[PDB]
C-alpha cells in the first residue's frame, strides 16, 4: 500500500535489523472468527490398538506413549492448540518411577485392568471407563501388577504449557480404592480434615461404576418426565473437583456423554478445542458439514469454532475433554447453538 | 457517674420522652468475649420420647413438634439465640400440606421409615438416620406412607430469622430415591443440566449409609497411618452443598462425629452455637466444667463461646448442627482449641 | 385446640417443667412477611442538638454519646433489631484511649473538625461530611485539637452482636490525611504492597470532597443525557471496600444519596433496617404511607420492609445505612419496587 | 533407543501416515523449567521514535504501528509468547473508525495530547502518562484533535489469541474526562448504577496525576517510616478493575514503578513475560546477568523465568504490562525472590 520508494525500501530494511514488524503489512492477526490451523481429524481405534501393539513388540523402551499429532499443527505432537492426547500402552508387569511436572494430566482406561498409578504415595487402580487425575506437580508414577497388557488414553496440557513458557519437571501396594476415593467419594459428604478448598480435585479416579449409573438414572429421569438430560435424549455428566464444584483441573475440561439411539444433537461451534473418545456404541459425528461414521475407541477432535453435532446409532458412550475452563477463567468462551 | 441534680434529672426527662438512651448509664452493650443468656443444656431423649408420645395420643391436631426451649431465652421457643430444635412427631397414616417460608429448615431421622416429605414435587423418602433438607423457599409437606410413628428432629434457623426481620411463609407417590438424589448423589460428578451453583444443596436426602460408610472408612485409616480423622480416634464429616463445596444452607451447617471407644476431645470455645445429637453409643460432655453422662437420642446445646469437649465410652455417633455459616459468612467466628 | 382434659393439663406441666414449647399452642414464630418490633421513627435534628449540648455541660463523664432507642425494642439502646445509631459530643480538647471490639463501626461527621480518631495508630482527621470507619478489631481512640465541640453519628452493629453472641472487647500526632488514605484513595491504583484482599476496607475516611464531587459529575451527567442516576433525579453512591468492590464492612452498608429538587423516589420494601440522615436541604419521608417533613440532620429509621420514599423539596442530600450486607450474605434479602 | 530393524522402519512410517508421534522419539516437551524461545530483548527509544516519524512521512496509510518483534519468535509480531507490544504513531488531525476484537488492549501514552479514543462512544482523551483501555469487545476508534503527532504503545494479547483461537472482529466530541471517569474515578465510592461487577475495569483512563501522586506518597511515607513500599525504594501500583479490586483485564497486568535513585531490585525468576518502559529517568537491567544501561521511552521483555533486576541511577519511573493473570487464573505462577 506506500509507494514503493527507495526511501520506502530502506524502512523496511531498518525494521528487518531493528525487530519492528509494521502492522500495515500484516489483518490475519486479528481474523472475523477463530480460524485455527488445528484441522478436524479423526483417529480409528484398531489403527491406535494395532501401532500400540506393535510398539509393545519393537520397543521395550518404555515411555510408550503415541501422541495424536493434528496434521495442521506443522508436525508438532499437539492434538489440538491447548491439548495433547496419546494412547500409551503398558506391557505385562512393566513400571514408570515417580515424577512431577506443572502440566495437567489424566488417563482414561479404555481396555485393561489390574494397574494402579501411584499419585503422591496413594495407589490408585485402574479398570475400564475409570477416569484417573494426575494434577499439575503430583508425584506420579505406575506398575502393572498383571501378565496382560493395559491401554489408556494420555490427555494433557502439554501444548497450552508449551507455548506459554510454564512447564517444570522433577524426578508397590494394590489396594482396591485409593485414600482420595474412601475420603472423597461419598456423595455431599465433605470430610473435617479436607476443609481448605484445593485447585484440582482430590478425587483419584471417577469409577466407571458411578459415570455408568449417573448416565442411566438421567435416561430413566427423561423416560418419567423429569428434567435430567441436556438434550432431548442426551445425558451427560462433567467429571467435578468436589471440593470447590468447578473443573476437575485447572486446564482441562472432562465430562462422559451417553446418547439414546437416534438423538443427534444440534450443531454447536465453541470456542477453544475439545477431544472425544467413543467408549461404546456406533454413531457418526459431523465436523464442517463433514459426516464420519464412529466404531468403539475412535477419537476425534473439533478445533476452536468448528460446527460440530453428533448421531447415535446405536446408543452412544462418549468420554470427552477439552480446554474450555481456559477459556472461561479468561472470558474468551462463546458458543453458537442452532435454534437459539 | 454525673453529679444528680435537679438540671440532671430533667436531662434523663427528656431523654426518655425524646427516646435517647445516654451510653454513660449503661458497657454490658460490648462484652469482653461471648456472654450468652442462652444456657448450656441437655434434653434426655427418654424424656422427649414419653412427651412425643402422649402428644400422639392427646393431640390429633397436628403441627404436633415439641420445640427444645433454652431455659435462658426468657419463655422463647428458642434452643439457642439462632436455632430451633424440636422433635416432631408423626403418626400412623397422617400428613401435612406444601408451605414454603423463608427460614431454612432441616429434619434428620431418628427412629421410623416410610415417610416421604416432598420438597418442591419431588419426594423424598427418609429413614433412620437420613438428613433432608427443606431449603428456604422450598414448598414443602410430606405423608406417612404406614401405620408406625416416626420421629425426626426439626432445625431451623427461626430465631435468627425472628429477631431479625427476614420470614415470609405462603400456603401421593412413594419413590425410593427422589430426583435430587438420583441426579445428585454421584460422587464427583455434576450433570450438565445443573451447572449453575446454588445457594442451599439440591440434594434431597443425605442417607445415612453414606454417612456411615464415611465414618467407617476414616476410621480405617488412621489404623492405617493415613491422614483422615480431624483428631485422634474423631473420625468426622460435614454436610455440603455439592455445586459449591460449601455449607447446606446459607444459615445453618451440619455435620455428623463418630468418635473411637475411649476418644476424648479437645476443649473448645467457637463463637455462635451448635446443638448435638447422640445418635448412637454412650458418653459424656463437659459443657463449663460440667461433665453431663448421655445416653443415645439426647440432645444438648452450646452456646457461643462455652467451653465443651466429648467423650466416648463406646463408639460414639453424633449428629450436629450450628450457625456457624452465620459467624463466618459475617467474619465473626473464632477458635479456641486447648495446645495450639 | 386440643381436648382441654385433666391429661392435657398434666402434659403442658410436663412442658414447663422439661423446657418443652409445642408449636401447636404458638405460626406468629413464622409470619407472612416480616412484621417488626422496631418501628419506624424520626429523630429532629435540633431535638439531639439541644440534649447533646446539654450533655456536654452535665456529663464532664465523657463517654457522651446519645442511643437512639427504637420506640418498638423494649427499652433496648437499639435503632432497628441489627443496628445502633448514637449522637457522640466530643467536648474542647477531650479524649479517649485506645481499645477494640468485634463490632463493626463507622463514625460520619455532622459539623465540626479538627478531631483526629486514630485507627490502628494511624491518625485520620474528621470533618463536616467524612464518613470514618473503625472496623471491627481495630484499636480506636481518639483526640480534639482544638477548643471546639463536634458532633458525629456513631453507627455500629451492636444490636446484631448482642443478640447474636459474637461481641470481644480488650482496652498525638495530627496529619491531614492518614496513611491509609495516602495509599488507598487513588482512583483505580492499588499499592503493590496491599495485594492480599481485606474483610473490612483499609480506606480510613471517605472524605466530604469526594463524596460531593460524585455525587454532581451523576446530576451532570443526566443533564447530558448519560446514563448515571440510579432513577431520574436521583444521584447516589456506595461506600466500599477498595480490595473488593463490596461493602465497607462485614455487617453495615453505608451510601449517600443526592436528589435534585422536585424528585419523589418510587416506593420500597426492603428486607432489614437502613437509617437516613439529612444531610443538607429539605423534603420529606413516607413510611407506611406516612409523610414527615425533613430538615437538616434529621435522622430515621425504616424497619425490615417498610414501604419507604424520599421526596426532595430542596436540592436533598442524605447520607443511608442499612444491615444488607448481613442480607445479602445469607440470601434473605429482597425487594418490592413500586411498577417493576 | 528401538533396535533400528525393518520392522522398526515400517512402524515409523505408519505412524508418519497415521499422523501418530510417539514420545520415545521425543522430554523437550517438557523442561525442567521454562525455557522460552522468546528471548530477552531491547528496544530503543530513539530508534523507535526515527522509524515511528519515517513511517509517519512514507504511509500515509494508516494503521502506523510498528510492533516490536521478539528475535526468537520465528519472524512473528510477538514481543512475547503473549503479548503484543506497538508503537501507533498517529499523525496531524487523523483518525480511525470503531471496529471491535475479543483481545484486549491497552494505549499507553508516551508523548503527546489533545488525542481521544472513543471507547463504545464515550471519548476518552489521551496524554503523557495515560494508560487507556480498550477491553476486549469494546468499539474503538480514535481522533487527533491537533496539528500535532502523537505516540502511544500499543499493549494486546495478541499473541496469546492467535496461538489458542479466540479471536473475533467486527467493524467527533472532545469533553475533557470521559463518562466512565467521572463516573468511576472517585476513591472507595461507587455509583448505585454500577453495583454489577465486569470482568474488565470501567475506567477509560487512568490518568498520569494519579499514577504519579500515588508513587510520591509511598516515597513520602518510607521517609517517615511507614510500610507502603514494596522493597526499599521501590515505590509502585498496580492498575485495577475498580469493582472487583483485580486485574485490568483478564488477559494483561499493568502496573507502575517509581524506584528512589541508587536502588537496585533482587533478582526474580518470574512464570510468564512481562514488558516495561521507561517513562522517566535513567538506569540498568539486568536479564540473565547480562546489563543493559536504559534512557527514557527504551522497552524491554522478560519472557517467563528469565532472571531480572533493574537499577535507578536517577529516579527511575517505569510503566509495566504482563501476561501474569492468564497464569495467576490458571495457577501457573511461580516466584524466585532471591534471600527468601
Ligand atoms: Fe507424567
Ligand atoms: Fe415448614
Ligand atoms: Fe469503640
Ligand atoms: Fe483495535
Known sequence: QPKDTPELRALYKS????????????????????????????????????????????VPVGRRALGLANPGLGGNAYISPTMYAGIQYLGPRETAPEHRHSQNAFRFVVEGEGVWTVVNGDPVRMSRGDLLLTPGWCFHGHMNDTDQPMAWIDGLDIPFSQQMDVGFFEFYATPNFSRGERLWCHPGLRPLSGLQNTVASPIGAYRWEFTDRALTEQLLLEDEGQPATVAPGHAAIRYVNPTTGGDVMPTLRCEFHRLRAGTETATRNEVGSTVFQVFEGAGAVVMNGETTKLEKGDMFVVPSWVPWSLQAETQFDLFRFSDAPIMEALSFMRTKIEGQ
Open 15 to 58: 525494521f528487518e535489523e531493528e525487530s519492528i514488524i509494521p502492522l500495515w503489512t500484516q489483518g490475519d492477526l486479528m481474523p472475523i472468527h477463530p480460524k485455527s490451523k488445528a484441522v478436524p481429524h479423526v483417529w480409528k481405534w484398531s489403527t491406535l490398538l494395532r501401532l500400540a501393539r506393535k510398539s509393545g513388540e519393537l
